[PDB]
Write a protein that binds this ligand. Structure first.
Ligand SMILES: CCCCCCCCCCCCCCCCC[C@@H](O)O[C@H](CO[C@H](O)CCCCCCCCCCCCCCC)COP(=O)(O)OCC[N+](C)(C)C
Lengths: 70, 175
């Protein structure tokens, strides 16, 4: 009666633990991958992150400058 | 009594002597047993019959749980957590069953020692040997794993034992 009224079968806890383990293992893998990706982008600078600004090329004046040799 | 299996818990045929009264003096033990029976066993027996018929009026069943086999830790990938979880649970259940097997053998040994009286050092040699074998197996399987034991540590211990055995056998073969 106690088991019927208050508790649940072993399979429920078993499968819930499987799901929790899957979720947290995926999270750990994603954390390692994030660290590696951050290191690579900061070292190289070829990704969307760590893009430090440079001078805009639309600021340059392309017109004769009173002197042929600029 | 069918309440337990006689093959798992063996008991000798229980041969007992017969009374051979050499004197006409009536003993107190037989009269005491007779009055004990009449005054104690009969009321207990009638109460048990009443309770047993009450139980027979309402008969219901309960079942033993069966567990399927799953891949063990030897056939689980290095970082695959789901198969590791299943193998770990299986290994823990097998560990519990092994503990109970050792318990059964120890109960056999204790019962033999009590039963044999003064000739226990001789008549319990089979039980002593069987307990020695079971103890050796259990000690090899599970000893020195630690408080944080697991299937991986048991596997590593077995692997180290097998390396030692293979090396010793190879050295003996080529000598
Ligand atoms: C002869 C009898 C011998 C046994 C006596 C047992 C008495 C039990 C009392 C102690 C029980 C402690 C509580 C244990 C569980 C409570 C918490 C939780 O586990 O239970 C919840 C449920 O709790 C109960 O609904 C309520 C419990 C409250 C007990 C209160 C008892 C004392 C009250 C005293 C009041 C006095 C009167 C007021 C005076 C002013 C959730 O259960 P639920 O998730 O649904 O279960 C579903 C199971 N399924 C999935 C298989 C279907």
């Amino acid at each position: 009666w106690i088991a019927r009224t208050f508790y649940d079968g072993p399979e429920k806890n078993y499968e819930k633990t499987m799901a929790i383990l899957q979720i947290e293992a995926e999270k750990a893998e994603l954390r390692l991958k994030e660290l590696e990706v951050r290191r690579l982008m900061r070292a190289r600078g070829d990704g969307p992150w760590y893009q430090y600004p440079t001078i805009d090329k639309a600021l340059i004046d392309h017109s004769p400058k009173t002197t042929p040799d600029n | 009594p069918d309440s337990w299996d006689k093959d798992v818990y063996p008991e000798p045929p229980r041969r007992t002597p017969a009374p051979a009264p050499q004197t006409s003096l009536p003993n107190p033990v037989t009269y005491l047993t007779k009055i004990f029976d009449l005054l104690v066993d009969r009321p207990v027996t009638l109460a048990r019959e009443f309770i047993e018929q009450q139980h027979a009026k309402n008969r219901y069943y309960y079942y033993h749980r069966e567990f399927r086999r799953v891949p063990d830790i030897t056939e689980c990938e290095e970082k695959d957590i789901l198969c590791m979880f299943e193998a770990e649970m299986q290994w823990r259940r097998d560990y519990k069953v092994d503990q109970e097997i050792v318990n059964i053998i120890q109960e056999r040994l204790k019962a033999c020692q009590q039963r044999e009286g003064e000739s226990y050092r001789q008549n319990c040699a089979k039980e002593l040997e069987q307990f020695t074998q079971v103890s050796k197996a259990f000690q090899d399987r599970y000893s020195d794993l630690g408080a944080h034991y697991s299937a991986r540590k048991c596997l590593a211990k077995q692997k180290q034992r097998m390396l030692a055995e293979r090396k010793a056998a190879k050295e003996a073969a080529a000598a």
